[PDB]
Design a protein around this ligand. Structure first.
Ligand code: APR
Ligand code: APR
Ligand code: K
Ligand code: K
Ligand code: ZN
Ligand code: ZN
Ligand code: ZN
Ligand code: ZN
Lengths: 373, 373
């Protein structure tokens, strides 16, 4: 039978402190739950933002991490589509396939377990993690910063058994989000002129998507010129630094493109840049997609004239991919060389030095750091 | 040859004052211009906005009016598609069919004569109107508040010769804008759940379009309950007054539709209602279209979370209709009973009583007042 597992995990006891490598207990999977052995995980801005304690609904203690890949260790009662040994990727955006959202082709925002997940609990209202006599909360329904995690059975994508887990764990968030922003949300046409604000993993993934879509011109924008080289390798036709111009960035872009871009993507989470991205779009048909997540309370603004004269403001979550059915296909596209994943890995670390992954992010010297469990 | 015409026109000598019926002179049409005998014209909120003096672009003296219908009196050199006697509708949104906007299927914002039109001048940089020795400016390239006006040849739609001009003049702006917002900008699908903010002529046209598109639910919203009766006649399934609730209107709509509407349309020009219209949209796939024109300087705002979680913000100008080719089609749809026009006329006045149309508009007692020249 499925026994409690004693393993290692990176616990965040409180905000503003480095993660603590602890020995924890992981309970067996209950009905419709899946226990996964995490093989590799990466760190994302979102993990750091929750860890900083600036996130309103961020609670502690908690096991963070939402970019991972592993193998099913055991399944709970009623689970038949998955079994021990299956190669998988945990999903923070699930796909029950039955709610009004899953049934609507225009969205991927399954709401089946959103409430419990937001509270760091499994669908039944409890947590499977414990450490030193204390209950530890789940995070984004994945909690990949542990040798073993338990997730709702609708939060699992079964992928190619041959996929390199130390690479595809990145499809758990960043790459998929940016790529999907281009092909699912924007659905840009061949020849499109694009502008991408923010050249981190998300922005690079957007560029990658724009290239797959056949974009003619792809202008990368970042205040950190060190990000330009890789952006060009991904397909950016040119890059510009807002700091190099006295005029607002939207004015610069409008001048460069004789009117503005056909599509702009904000991959930073800065409301001021979001406005610039919208205003940088061409009159009549320009479309701007918000991909970055802004701090709570902050709002975007512009003059309605911008919309009346043809521009559209959109946003995306996990690139609009219906998770369970898309992630496996994304893995296959990587396996077949249609999209890149390896090029996103700039650093590799062992589980014990996971905190170094956070240092690297604050330093601005990394795209994605893969942590080997 | 074509001589100078001495006729009457409603001149706006200065901001904040009523219009004055004056004896003016209308010069003959120059190359690529068309002189039109106006038979009927209506008054629109935009005309009042400019007359008030609040319009940063408003210049005086000027002959306002952009909702009209008439007969071609004469044409200038180089004009062959039009001739004396043709039944027409002046267009504030022209269609040269050659600029980058006209060539793009995604917009109707022809820019060929925008500069001169914004200055109240014909394409050659001069005005065809004079009164008591003074130059009188054109307005929105149409100046329909005159027995005779001169417009650019690309600002003319030739229509069905049997069309009643005292009715189709309304297709010059209001009806076309609202109808188009639904079928062109929103492109709502059959069964869609919609909300229309503002039940004036524009909102009624939106409702009309939603019904043609096969919406399952059309919720009209207006603080003036006297507008509900006609809204229901146009197809509204129910009407609500924001004043009858203590919660923000978006919360009311969300609760009424189990999540929000599929499509919302703001037909008021109120930035606060614009935000509410967006937020009243369903998570994941809701789309809000701004149709009303907000006062200069004001801006719309919301939390980017609204977009990231699936909502889309759009806007429209003259319903997205490429003017020259669309208006004749709209007249034909009216003649065949596909769309309504007569139902928008609530009042009729003589030219000398034109100022009463403005009074009726501000009193909130009318939808559209048709002025017989
Ligand atoms: N004002 C700015 N203008 C242009 N670029 C900027 C600006 N401010 C920051 N940037 C650049 O934005 C980039 C952000 O990339 P990352 O921090 O590495 O984050 P990433 O993983 O790519 O995701 C970014 C955003 O998208 C969301 O999906 C994610 O949660 C975060 O909100 C960095 O290169 C940063 O220099
Ligand atoms: N806060 C509000 N909430 C709901 N309805 C409102 C509100 N404020 C005003 N209204 C209603 O909005 C309606 C506006 O209709 P009209 O004044 O008759 O204007 P209309 O011709 O329909 O055009 C409206 C708008 O569209 C624009 O493009 C046009 O220039 C104007 O900005 C009126 O019925 C008014 O009662
Ligand atoms: K598109
Ligand atoms: K649509
Ligand atoms: Zn679902
Ligand atoms: Zn993430
Ligand atoms: Zn044109
Ligand atoms: Zn108008």
């Amino acid at each position: 039978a499925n026994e409690v597992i004693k393993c290692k995990a990176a616990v965040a006891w409180e905000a503003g402190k480095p993660l603590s490598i602890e020995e924890i207990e992981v309970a067996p999977p209950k009905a419709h739950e899946v226990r996964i052995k995490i093989i590799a995980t990466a760190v994302c801005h979102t993990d750091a933002y929750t860890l900083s304690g600036a996130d309103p609904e961020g609670c502690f203690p908690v096991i963070l991490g939402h970019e991972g890949a592993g193998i099913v260790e055991s399944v709970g009662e009623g689970v038949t589509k998955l079994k021990a040994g299956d190669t998988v990727i945990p999903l923070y955006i699930p796909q029950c396939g039955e709610c009004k959202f899953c049934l609507n082709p225009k969205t991927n925002l399954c709401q089946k377990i959103r409430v419990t997940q937001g509270k760091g609990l499994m669908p039944d209202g409890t947590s499977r993690f414990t450490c030193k006599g204390k209950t530890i909360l789940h995070y984004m329904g994945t909690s990949t910063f542990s040798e073993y995690t338990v997730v709702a059975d609708i939060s699992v994508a079964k992928i190619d058994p041959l996929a390199p887990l130390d690479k595809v764990c990145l499809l758990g968030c960043g790459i998929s989000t940016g790529y999907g922003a281009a092909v699912n949300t924007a659905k840009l046409e061949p020849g499109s002129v694009c502008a991408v604000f923010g050249l981190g993993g998300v922005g690079l993934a957007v560029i990658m998507g724009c290239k797959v879509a056949g974009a003619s011109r792809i202008i990368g924008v970042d205040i950190n010129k060190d990000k330009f080289a890789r952006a060009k390798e991904f397909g950016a036709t040119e890059c510009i630094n807002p700091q190099d111009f006295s005029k607002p960035i939207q004015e610069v872009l409008i001048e460069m493109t004789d009117g503005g871009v056909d599509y702009s993507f904000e991959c930073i989470g800065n409301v001021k840049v979001m406005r610039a991205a919208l205003e940088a779009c061409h009159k009549g048909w320009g479309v701007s997609v918000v991909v970055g997540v802004a701090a709570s309370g902050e709002e975007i603004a512009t003059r309605p004239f911008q919309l009346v004269t043809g521009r559209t403001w959109k946003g995306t979550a996990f690139g609009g991919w219906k998770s369970v059915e898309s992630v496996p296909k994304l893995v296959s596209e990587y396996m077949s060389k249609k999209i890149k994943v390896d090029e996103f890995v700039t650093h590799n670390l062992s589980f014990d030095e996971i905190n170094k992954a956070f240092e690297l992010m604050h330093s601005g010297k990394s795209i994605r750091t893969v942590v080997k469990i």
